[PDB]
Amino acid sequence: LDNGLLQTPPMGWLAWERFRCNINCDEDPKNCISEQLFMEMADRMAQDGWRDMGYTYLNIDDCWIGGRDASGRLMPDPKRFPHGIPFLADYVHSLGLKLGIYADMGNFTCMGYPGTTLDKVVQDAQTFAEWKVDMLKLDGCFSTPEERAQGYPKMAAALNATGRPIAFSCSWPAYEGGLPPRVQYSLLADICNLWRNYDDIQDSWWSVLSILNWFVEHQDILQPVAGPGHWNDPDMLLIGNFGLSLEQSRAQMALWTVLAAPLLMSTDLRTISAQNMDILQNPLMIKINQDPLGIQGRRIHKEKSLIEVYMRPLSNKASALVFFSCRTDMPYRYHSSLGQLNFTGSVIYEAQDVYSGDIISGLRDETNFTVIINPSGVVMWYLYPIKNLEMSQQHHHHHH
Amino acid sequence: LDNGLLQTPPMGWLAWERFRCNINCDEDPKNCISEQLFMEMADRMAQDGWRDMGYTYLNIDDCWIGGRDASGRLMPDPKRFPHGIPFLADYVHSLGLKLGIYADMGNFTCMGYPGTTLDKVVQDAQTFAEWKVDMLKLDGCFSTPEERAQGYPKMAAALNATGRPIAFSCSWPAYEGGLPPRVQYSLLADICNLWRNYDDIQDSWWSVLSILNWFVEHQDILQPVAGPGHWNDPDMLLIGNFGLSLEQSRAQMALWTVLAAPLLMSTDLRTISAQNMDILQNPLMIKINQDPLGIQGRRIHKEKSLIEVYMRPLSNKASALVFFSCRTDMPYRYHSSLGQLNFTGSVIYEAQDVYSGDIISGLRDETNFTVIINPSGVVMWYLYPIKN
Numbered sequence: 201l202d203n204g205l206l207q208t209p210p211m212g213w214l215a216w217e218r219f220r221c222n223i224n225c226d227e228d229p230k231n232c233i234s235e236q237l238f239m240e241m242a243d244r245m246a247q248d249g250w251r252d253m254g255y256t257y258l259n260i261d262d263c264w265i266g267g268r269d270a271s272g273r274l275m276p277d278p279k280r281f282p283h284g285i286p287f288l289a290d291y292v293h294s295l296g297l298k299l300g301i302y303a304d305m306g307n308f309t310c311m312g313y314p315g316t317t318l319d320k321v322v323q324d325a326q327t328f329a330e331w332k333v334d335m336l337k338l339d340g341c342f343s344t345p346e347e348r349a350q351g352y353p354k355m356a357a358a359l360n361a362t363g364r365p366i367a368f369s370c371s372w373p374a375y376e377g378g379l380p381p382r383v384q385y386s387l388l389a390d391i392c393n394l395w396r397n398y399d400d401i402q403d404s405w406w407s408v409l410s411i412l413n414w415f416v417e418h419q420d421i422l423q424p425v426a427g428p429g430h431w432n433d434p435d436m437l438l439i440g441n442f443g444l445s446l447e448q449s450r451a452q453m454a455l456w457t458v459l460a461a462p463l464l465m466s467t468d469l470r471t472i473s474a475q476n477m478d479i480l481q482n483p484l485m486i487k488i489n490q491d492p493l494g495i496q497g498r499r500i501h502k503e504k505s506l507i508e509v510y511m512r513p514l515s516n517k518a519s520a521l522v523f524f525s526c527r528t529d530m531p532y533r534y535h536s537s538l539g540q541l542n543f544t545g546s547v548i549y550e551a552q553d554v555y556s557g558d559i560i561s562g563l564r565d566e567t568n569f570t571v572i573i574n575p576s577g578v579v580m581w582y583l584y585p586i587k588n589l590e591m592s593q594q595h596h597h598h599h600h
Numbered sequence: 601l602d603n604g605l606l607q608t609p610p611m612g613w614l615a616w617e618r619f620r621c622n623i624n625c626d627e628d629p630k631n632c633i634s635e636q637l638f639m640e641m642a643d644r645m646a647q648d649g650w651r652d653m654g655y656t657y658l659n660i661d662d663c664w665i666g667g668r669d670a671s672g673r674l675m676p677d678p679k680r681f682p683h684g685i686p687f688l689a690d691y692v693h694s695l696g697l698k699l700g701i702y703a704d705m706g707n708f709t710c711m712g713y714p715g716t717t718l719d720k721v722v723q724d725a726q727t728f729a730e731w732k733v734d735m736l737k738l739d740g741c742f743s744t745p746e747e748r749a750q751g752y753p754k755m756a757a758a759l760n761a762t763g764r765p766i767a768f769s770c771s772w773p774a775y776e777g778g779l780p781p782r783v784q785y786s787l788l789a790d791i792c793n794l795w796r797n798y799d800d801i802q803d804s805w806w807s808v809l810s811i812l813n814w815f816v817e818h819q820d821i822l823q824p825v826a827g828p829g830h831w832n833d834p835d836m837l838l839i840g841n842f843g844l845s846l847e848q849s850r851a852q853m854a855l856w857t858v859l860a861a862p863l864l865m866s867t868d869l870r871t872i873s874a875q876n877m878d879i880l881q882n883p884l885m886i887k888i889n890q891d892p893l894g895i896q897g898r899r900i901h902k903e904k905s906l907i908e909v910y911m912r913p914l915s916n917k918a919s920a921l922v923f924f925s926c927r928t929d930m931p932y933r934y935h936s937s938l939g940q941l942n943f944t945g946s947v948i949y950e951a952q953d954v955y956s957g958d959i960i961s962g963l964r965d966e967t968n969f970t971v972i973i974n975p976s977g978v979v980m981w982y983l984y985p986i987k988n
């Protein structure tokens with residue numbers, strides 16, 4: 201979507217995976233969907249390095265809506281959002297963050313809250329712009345294929361007409377099976393900044409694998425459609441929650457990064473462990489995810505040993521490689537060479553291990569190397585021509 | 601098996617899950633299957649509280665065998681076990697531990713090492729007793745059903761005849777589908793101290809769930825056959841390795857415990873985290889697993905909320921309850937009462953949360969309680985009647 205936004209994948213925090221549709225503030229005031237929850241997460245994002253590392257979106261998901269007023273205007277739940285949404289947006293903006301919100305293109309939201317039907321699309325867009333929202337996720341429950349075909353373009357047009365840049369996240373393709381001919385990715389790229397292609401993620405490794413395997417099965421279709429301003433969205437990061445081991449958490453971060461995915465966390469930032477913070481705030485990982493070329497990666501190799509290799513092209517003739525073990529036994533010594541991974545030419549390379557920081561020098565196409573990969577885990581390299589180091593130091597500047 | 605052994609489920613360490621068939625001692629000397637690995641694990645068991653908490657078996661699995669000598673006597677691989685097996689048995693015994701070993705009722709072990717064919721069963725039993733082994737795991741790769749039907753009883757008889765008490769772990773039923781009519785559990789109970797019913801565990805939560813689900817689906821058959829001296833074996837604990845989250849690690853420990861399973865770890869004790877050590881060395885958990893009645897628990901309730909409740913009866917009118925969440929969303933507030941979980945009337949109970957240590961006192965059958973269960977996790981109670 202050509203609205204100036206999301207030239208790199210969006211980074212931030214979304215309420216849904218961790219906090220879901222918890223509205224019992226009487227019994228569970230610390231974890232319920234409420235203005236307090238968002239204000240506290242905002243504070244954490246401003247204070248604990250998240251914003252400074254690039255995590256700028258704080259997004260409301262389903263179950264925020266109280267109803268519509270006498271004029272049809274959306275209102276948040278007054279008991280849970282007593283100061284209103286404008287107050288919340290002001291607060292978030294005061295901390296250098298952006299506010300996202302949620303609506304559904306259909307009769308109701310997936311959890312049964314008031315829907316944005318076709319006759320409310322424009323009014324709801326205008327309301328969100330008036331509240332100074334910065335992002336909209338538009339779900340597609342309780343609608344027909346025809347309503348979605350009309351509604352998603354209608355909302356993109358309505359948002360545009362407000363004059364406020366609002367990042368637009370579209371669930372449209374997930375409801376149509378994610379593939380052509382039912383999904384037209386050329387249109388999606390013109391009307392949305394990102395789109396959910398496939399199933400909702402759940403807090404399990406099986407869920408991550410299910411999503412990864414669908415994206416890889418269909419990468420010939422999906423890889424080319426992503427780029428600056430228009431991303432595939434494999435759904436939220438699970439890091440910090442209950443279902444992923446350490447190796448699995450590092451794997452999801454690495455694989456979402458190689459896929460040029462949004463880095464949308466959904467976890468309790470108030471209690472997140474240092475170990476998990478270190479994964480999400482890894483500066484090299486983030487640089488890779490945010491690479492300005494915005495070229496989505498691919499799986500380039502799969503071995504009988506159940507080791508898979510993913511590669512993402514990056515700026516300055518660099519690459520990211522993720523060596524991923526689908527084994528379930530023990531650490532595995534994977535023997536390869538850049539030549540076997542379809543690197544050609546006379547380039548000598550160096551690599552930095554993204555998680556350890558260790559440098560491997562003197563890699564030619566023919567050079568045999570070994571990486572030790574843990575089960576359901578990864579090894580990730582930032583790989584660059586060694587001449588990149590010299591060229592970066594030898595740029596001559598003039599005042600203009 | 602009526603040999604006086606394993607009147608409670610065995611506790612210890614088994615090499616297989618974590619270390620597998622790693623024989624590359626040149627490239628990977630710290631992690632290969634070797635005398636050194638077992639000695640180092642024995643040292644950790646003696647020094648870091650494992651033995652003292654009840655973890656007493658140190659078990660060799662596949663890939664130890666070097667060949668047979670001119671008399672057909674089994675030998676370990678001389679490069680990886682230079683001092684031989686008696687040396688290792690004697691070492692482990694000096695530390696107050698027991699040594700387990702591995703053989704296969706068939707032409708070869710599962711990884712292709714020399715097998716214990718029918719004509720070698722007695723000689724191999726005699727060799728193991730001479731070496732002063734304390735437990736034998738007998739796998740069943742590379743054999744026929746008829747060979748296994750002859751061989752497993754033959755080995756039980758041969759072990760007995762040596763005069764050395766050797767705990768006998770039998771993989772027989774796993775090769776025949778684990779169920780009647782092909783598996784006869786009254787026969788198994790007579791010839792084995794424990795048996796692998798089902799698939800090898802792998803380092804994944806999906807593997808744990810697959811095993812749990814098969815055990816629960818067939819619990820009407822499996823629950824009654826377990827007892828002192830004869831246990832169902834759902835395979836090794838994964839705690840300390842790579843595939844399980846913290847919640848899942850706590851869940852496996854609790855569920856194996858309510859199932860009266862062996863607690864056979866398979867993890868690097870040299871590098872195990874404090875958090876994982878605390879799960880495995882939980883004294884109340886171990887007390888429950890080792891309960892002298894040896895009554896295997898059952899799943900007693902399954903709710904549309906995807907909360908499952910397991911119960912194990914214990915000594916002195918006590919019980920263990922495991923509240924297990926199969927949800928994959930977020931923590932769940934599970935509302936129940938002991939009356940809804942079929943507890944006996946007019947009794948007042950006290951419960952201890954096995955992981956937190958918190959005490960809940962004065963629970964009557966009608967008393968409503970809430971437990972907060974994390975996704976792919978558990979809450980476990982040790983429950984007993986009280987006066988007051």
Ligand SMILES: *[C@@H]1O[C@H](CO)[C@@H](O[C@@H]2O[C@H](CO)[C@@H](O[C@@H]3O[C@H](CO[C@H]4O[C@H](CO)[C@@H](O)[C@H](O)[C@@H]4O)[C@@H](O)[C@H](O[C@H]4O[C@H](CO)[C@@H](O)[C@H](O)[C@@H]4O)[C@@H]3O)[C@H](O)[C@H]2NC(C)=O)[C@H](O)[C@H]1NC(C)=O
Pocket residue numbers: 202203204205359360361362363364365366
């Ligand atoms: C409603 O929808 C319309 C489209 O129908 C949107 O209009 C587009 O808005 C984007 C973003 O603001 C515009 O893109 C920007 O154009 C700037 C100016 O370029 C002009 O000059 C060139 C000359 O060759 C023309 O070709 C071009 O059409 C423009 O007239 C650029 O400077 C901007 O560059 C940005 O990215 C580069 C990265 O390479 C950075 O270096 C810059 O710093 C900068 O960030 C950018 O490309 C686009 O021109 C508009 N299109 C049209 C047709 O007008 C509205 O934004 C949208 N409104 C809302 C509210 O959503």
Ligand SMILES: *[C@@H]1O[C@H](CO)[C@@H](O[C@@H]2O[C@H](CO)[C@@H](O[C@@H]3O[C@H](CO[C@H]4O[C@H](CO)[C@@H](O)[C@H](O)[C@@H]4O)[C@@H](O)[C@H](O[C@H]4O[C@H](CO)[C@@H](O)[C@H](O)[C@@H]4O)[C@@H]3O)[C@H](O)[C@H]2NC(C)=O)[C@H](O)[C@H]1NC(C)=O
Pocket residue numbers: 602603604759760761762763764765766
């Ligand atoms: C080789 O195989 C033989 C035959 O199976 C084994 O011999 C058996 O060993 C077990 C365990 O030591 C014996 O079981 C114990 O028997 C005790 C008394 O039994 C007497 O009465 C029976 C007839 O009723 C006679 O056969 C026997 O000779 C005795 O005179 C019991 O007191 C023990 O009870 C234990 O369990 C109960 C609950 O189950 C508890 O309440 C008790 O506290 C106690 O812990 C137990 O039942 C069995 O009797 C032996 N059988 C025979 C025929 O000798 C060998 O052990 C085995 N050898 C090796 C090396 O493996």
Ligand SMILES: *[C@@H]1O[C@H](CO)[C@@H](O[C@@H]2O[C@H](CO)[C@@H](O[C@@H]3O[C@H](CO)[C@@H](O)[C@H](O)[C@@H]3O)[C@H](O)[C@H]2NC(C)=O)[C@H](O)[C@H]1NC(C)=O
Pocket residue numbers: 707742743744
């Ligand atoms: C366990 O080992 C025994 C002994 O080695 C196996 O029996 C042997 O099996 C081999 C290979 O199948 C037989 O050789 C073959 O015989 C056929 C007969 O025509 C021939 O066409 C082949 O070219 C080949 O020579 C061999 O005869 C047989 N020997 C004996 C003494 O039985 C047995 O198969 C193994 N069992 C299991 C369950 O793996």
Ligand SMILES: *[C@@H]1O[C@H](CO[C@@H]2O[C@@H](C)[C@@H](O)[C@@H](O)[C@@H]2O)[C@@H](O[C@@H]2O[C@H](CO)[C@@H](O)[C@H](O)[C@H]2NC(C)=O)[C@H](O)[C@H]1NC(C)=O
Pocket residue numbers: 307342343344
């Ligand atoms: C979205 O809602 C419309 C409007 O009808 C509402 O929903 C119905 C299920 C019912 O509860 C009505 O009382 C509500 O007002 C649905 O359109 C109706 O669809 C039914 C068939 O289900 C049809 O018989 C009616 O003619 C339709 N009514 C109107 C006014 O057009 C629509 O089907 C709903 N869409 C989805 C995807 O759920």
Ligand SMILES: *[C@@H]1O[C@H](CO)[C@@H](O)[C@H](O)[C@H]1NC(C)=O
Pocket residue numbers: 566567568
């Ligand atoms: C890489 O290893 C193979 C054997 O696996 C060997 O034949 C080859 O010479 C090695 N390449 C180099 C450049 O040493």
Ligand SMILES: *[C@@H]1O[C@H](CO)[C@@H](O)[C@H](O)[C@H]1NC(C)=O
Pocket residue numbers: 966967968
């Ligand atoms: C327990 O709660 C239920 C509501 O689900 C209520 O009907 C019942 O009276 C309560 N029982 C007691 C003993 O308070």
Ligand SMILES: OC[C@H]1O[C@@H](O)[C@H](O)[C@@H](O)[C@@H]1O
Pocket residue numbers: 504505506526527528529802803
């Ligand atoms: O090929 C890889 C696989 O090898 C098998 O021998 C192991 O049991 C699996 O856990 C492992 O994933």
Ligand SMILES: OC[C@H]1O[C@H](O)[C@H](O)[C@@H](O)[C@@H]1O
Pocket residue numbers: 446447450553555556574577578579580
């Ligand atoms: O947990 C996996 C990571 O562990 C260590 O950091 C390794 O050095 C790194 O290569 C690997 O990716």
Ligand SMILES: OC[C@H]1O[C@H](O)[C@H](O)[C@@H](O)[C@@H]1O
Pocket residue numbers: 402403904905906926927928929
């Ligand atoms: O019923 C339990 C289930 O509810 C919802 O469908 C959630 O998406 C799922 O993660 C959870 O396990």
Ligand SMILES: OC[C@H]1O[C@H](O)[C@H](O)[C@@H](O)[C@@H]1O
Pocket residue numbers: 846847850953955956974977978979980
């Ligand atoms: O991680 C799960 C455990 O967390 C805490 O210890 C809880 O107090 C306990 O009830 C629960 O079983």
